[PDB]
Amino acid sequence: EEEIAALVIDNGSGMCKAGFAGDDAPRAVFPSIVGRPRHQGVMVGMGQKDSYVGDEAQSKRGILTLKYPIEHGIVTNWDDMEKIWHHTFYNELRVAPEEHPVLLTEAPLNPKANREKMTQIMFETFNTPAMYVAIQAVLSLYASGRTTGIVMDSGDGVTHTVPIYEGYALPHAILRLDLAGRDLTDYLMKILTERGYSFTTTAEREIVRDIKEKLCYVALDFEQEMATAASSSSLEKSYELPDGQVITIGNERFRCPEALFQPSFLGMESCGIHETTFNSIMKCDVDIRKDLYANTVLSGGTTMYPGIADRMQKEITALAPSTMKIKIIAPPERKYSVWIGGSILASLSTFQQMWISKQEYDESGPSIVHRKCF
């Protein structure tokens, strides 16, 4: 075949988004979880299967304890990650990685060890001709088809912010904020408890993740919505648990995402996301700011909440000079923006020379990741 295709994998914590480069959507997207049988089984002709990976784990949740191998964009446990990748290639895609160059995503400002060790695995686990490790934000910017913008990247892992102008990139200006979907989830299960509902275990932690993925939304003004919580009508929603129990969540709903804008709720000093965006833009040269204000791109799973764009717009506009208009461009399909970006990058002809080649690695070692790529 010509070009051999190429493989693309986005692993921020939470989800693996994988598929062939050269396609508009990934084939396989499943949770990055390694569940292990915590309870000793007593039958015969079970499994045994030491552990389960991917949406298999979601299916068989109750038995397993689930461990997310990636936290804050850092891989805690490598064998687990390897297992997840194994599952992606063999269980879903059904590819021999020897037959494809593979692109990995990775978060900014992230420890060297992850990049280096990541590459070490790809070469000395799944024998592969070539690979590349790329910054998440840039990829989403490509996916949006814009050359310039400040990409607000918040996955389940961590939140990141990379201003870009006319390609280029500003290292000093790049900002990385420790908040995530996962931290919102931890907050949310906390806030439920004041209602009586107690979710103590990893299994049901994912149930609240599911709740947040739909029920929660961001206030266009927090205090107003909280005021109107007095007369509860629309702000309460019934949710059905798999157990059959019913949950009813009022104001607690929208204050969950509020945390992004008020990390004091979580107890961290680190400024809210909008202020971090200012922190990034303000670090940039005076000249370019005009378009960064106007070209803010949101990406990642934890920007999905309804109404986030609007709130960011209102806050940024409030803070900034009203001399210039602040457009925020947040597409739907943002969740997959990183992966799409990866697809487009591996599809690019010129890119086909920038790969880290197996050969190059074998001569020069794992450390070469930083040398060559950003």
- Residues forming contacts to ligand ADP in the complex (CB under 6 A) are 10, 12-15, 155-157, 181, 184-185, 209, 212-213, 300-302, 304-305, 335, 338
Q: Which one of ligand ADP, Mg ion, a second copy, none interacts with residue 335, CB within 5 to 8 A by kind?
A: ligand ADP
How many other CB atoms are found less than 10 A from the CB of residue 4? 13
Taking the least distance from each CB to Mg ion, the nearer of 123 and 342 is 342
Q: Which one of ligand ADP, a second copy, Mg ion, none interacts with residue 27, CB within 5 to 8 A by kind?
A: none
Q: If you count DSSP H runs as helices and E runs as strands, how many of each does the chain have, helices first?
A: 14, 18
CB 160 within 8 A of CB 136: yes
Residue number with the smallest Cβ distance to ligand ADP: 12
Q: How many residues lie near Mg ion (CB under 5 A)?
A: 4
Query: Binding of Mg ion at residue 73 (CB under 5 A)?
Result: no
Query: Binding of Mg ion at residue 300 (CB under 5 A)?
Result: yes
Q: Cβ 306 to a second copy, closest distance in Å?
A: 26
Q: Cβ 147 to a second copy, closest distance in Å?
A: 8
Non-local (6+) Cβ contacts of 211 within 8 A are 188, 239, 247, 249
- Report how far residue 101's alpha carbon sits from residue 1's, in angstroms, rounded to the nearest whole number: 14
Taking the least distance from each CB to a second copy, the nearer of 23 and 116 is 116
Taking the least distance from each CB to a second copy, the nearer of 47 and 306 is 47
The region that residue 333 occupies, defined by phi over 0 for left and psi between -120 and 50 for alpha, beta otherwise, is: left
Among 12, 26, 35, 73, the residue binding Mg ion under the rule CB under 5 A is: 12
159 beta partners: 154, 177
Non-local (6+) Cβ contacts of 112 within 8 A are 370
| Torsion angles phi and psi, residue 249, rounded to 5 | -125, 120
Q: Which one of ligand ADP, a second copy, Mg ion, none interacts with residue 195, CB within 5 to 8 A by kind?
A: a second copy
Binding site for Mg ion (CB under 5 A): 12, 155, 300, 338
